Amino acid sequence: NASVVSKGLANLSLELRKPVSFDIITADTLEQAIERAGTKHGNKGWEAALSAIEMANLYKSLRGTEHHHHLHGSSIEIYEGKLTAEGLRFGIVASRFNHTLVDRLVEGAIDCIVRHGGRGEDITLVRVPGAWEIPVAADELARKEDIDAVIAFGDLI
Amino acid sequence: FDYNASVVSKGLANLSLELRKPVSFDIITADTLEQAIERAGTKHGNKGWEAALSAIEMANLYKSLRGTEHHHHLHGSSIEIYEGKLTAEGLRFGIVASRFNHTLVDRLVEGAIDCIVRHGGRGEDITLVRVPGAWEIPVAADELARKEDIDAVIAFGDL
Amino acid sequence: NASVVSKGLANLSLELRKPVSFDIITADTLEQAIERAGTKHGNKGWEAALSAIEMANLYKSLRGTEHHHHLHGSSIEIYEGKLTAEGLRFGIVASRFNHTLVDRLVEGAIDCIVRHGGRGEDITLVRVPGAWEIPVAADELARKEDIDAVIAFGDLIR
Amino acid sequence: FDYNASVVSKGLANLSLELRKPVSFDIITADTLEQAIERAGTKHGNKGWEAALSAIEMANLYKSLRGTEHHHHLHGSSIEIYEGKLTAEGLRFGIVASRFNHTLVDRLVEGAIDCIVRHGGRGEDITLVRVPGAWEIPVAADELARKEDIDAVIAFGDL
Amino acid sequence: NASVVSKGLANLSLELRKPVSFDIITADTLEQAIERAGTKHGNKGWEAALSAIEMANLYKSLRGTEHHHHLHGSSIEIYEGKLTAEGLRFGIVASRFNHTLVDRLVEGAIDCIVRHGGRGEDITLVRVPGAWEIPVAADELARKEDIDAVIAFGDLI
């Protein structure tokens, strides 16, 4: 499975007369734990931002003047939110405590908004000393009329 | 029973209901291995945080000690006290780091730059110099120290 | 070795009367290993891009007309690829699978290119979900005229 | 002590009192056997969710790679990045499934259709083809792939 | 490490012709625990006041008409509070119960405000019988329009 791609690139190098390289990495027992720790936190930030895009679009359609697809048959309205973060302004609140691991969640939540059609100019990040100040900082962000969703990352347990 | 994780959840939940905006609340979950990595990372961050903090205090102490300013008293007992304020406003600093073991010493540098900026230090006044190894530090540090527009020099080794 | 550097800075601080400081970061058995993995991955991407720079220069010399060097004063012509990456356009293909360790390779390769005179404007990065779609991504990118080399990084094994 | 089941009960109870409308709140209760069935069901749903998700990314990657569009940068360092947006708007897809073990593969198909629709994919553009077994897939998949109005093809086997 | 400073002061005495002394203290197994107990509480008061200076400055910049430094790249606004307690009025609420240890926190939080550019004339201290009266006493302090942050010290657990 890994040897075939090397052969394909090798044949490509001779065909196009360009230097095309290929390299892999062998992992010991420890780097696998390090790699899995990073991916797990990245997914948690990815899912946290994803749950906010759906809710933001749900409010858009729930208060809309246009009803949509019914149930498996008909005569039963269904409301749900699309995963399209286009034109939505977000706000992220993170705690400085344990910043070596909280920043993984923030990076894993920014690209999720970006890859779903959202531009970085509509993202506002706020950092707080600890988890205790999160509710009172997210309150001030929500006072802004240019915010549609708030994502908060803590560090406990 | 945590008194911290419970109150933060109650506050955010009421915040969303009262303002009618979704507030996605997610926390971390580590089990005996990410905690060790996290504690190792923050230990290095604090190591470079306090290294740049003492330089600010000493730099202000020299300015106040040889300056002409009637200082305050301990409590009003007329015993004047000389101490260094933790306000790096107007101070210019220079950092020397070795790229050997750069995956760790860069956290020391990053944890020292924000310590200067948050205390009022402007970004225009921080100069960073990188060297292949610790054996190159003394000559590089000597060059920065002779400059008149440098109030402190911070160096980080390798281990 | 670590003491003479500290003593030299101590004398320098006393001479100039300013806070010259020096600190060494300790390391337990665990954080030593994570540092060793980081350096290993960084070097792996460093040499990966280093070979591409040499090969790109060699092909540019063969196609060109420059009798630059000779061997020991003899009339024979020895063709060699310099390690100056100025004026070369690169393309990097990386798999997002296990992006924690793969990103170490990507930054190492970019660091090697920029330190050898290369520019950031001439680097093109392509991300793919896995390693099985690298060849289709690579040959689509490699056929572009403004690409002098292509570097591909797969996912981890074992 | 759950921080999730407690806050949801408090919010709904106050919601009914403040609005004077009954809010029947019922949750699930499983003990070591429905949990295994539930986890088995959601594992298949995610299996077909990501299968259709990678097709969207690859389809957009090809369009952007061979297209004439100045792409954005990593952070502003001028290194342009090519990546596939997860917006299946305007893409047309074709799914081939085998009715062998239809009680499981239909969850894969159902978990892939909603993944396309929720990401903006219109329902008019999804075409589903069923075959008696996996041995009929290659010819059926070949017929769909040759169509010009097909941007991706997804197939599900049997086991 | 300790002998060199004594030699340096000794040479200074001969050079300047002034009596310059130097003294150290040797600690047994118990005074080390006593010393560590005092430092640990002093840090807790130091950190508690530090977390209030940052939040007070965060409100100043969050409601400001001037946006500041972006993320590691650009196009993403970041809001954070400087550790400059200049011009900020504070209020401290402490409980008389266990006053032999609560006063350590108060002293460790007053100098933190002082060493960061804050003058003592903007600090208001209020003492209460027990921890139960802290929320209702901090409420009255916050009613004052000349208060920007409230620090509360209890004694339980």
Add this chain to the structure above:
Amino acid sequence: NASVVSKGLANLSLELRKPVSFDIITADTLEQAIERAGTKHGNKGWEAALSAIEMANLYKSLRGTEHHHHLHGSSIEIYEGKLTAEGLRFGIVASRFNHTLVDRLVEGAIDCIVRHGGRGEDITLVRVPGAWEIPVAADELARKEDIDAVIAFGDLI
């Protein structure tokens, strides 16, 4: 791996009707030991010259009139040495004692300067009878105004 090249060249020779020959060399235990020692010495000289190139560029930019190359986003300026030996003049000091070994170090360093864009006219080699004449000999070279770095190799130990 080793045989695939032979098959590829055979097809290349047939396609162009031109002689193309490939062959490998078999080594016993003794020749393997001596050849890895020679490569080890070459790497040692390569590393020694590489550090000199970087340090020479660092000082050149450190005292340069121009100020640029700021950090990404922030306004702090980073000083670092590029690995481009173009325009730099070097000087190498080697001892005749154990010349069979030192010459590999010298040759392993000359190519490193040349392969990084350094001309051969800027390299100056100086040979001394032994390592005990290096300090004075290196001192004389350093005083020259057309020398940017000095590399010295000692005797075996």
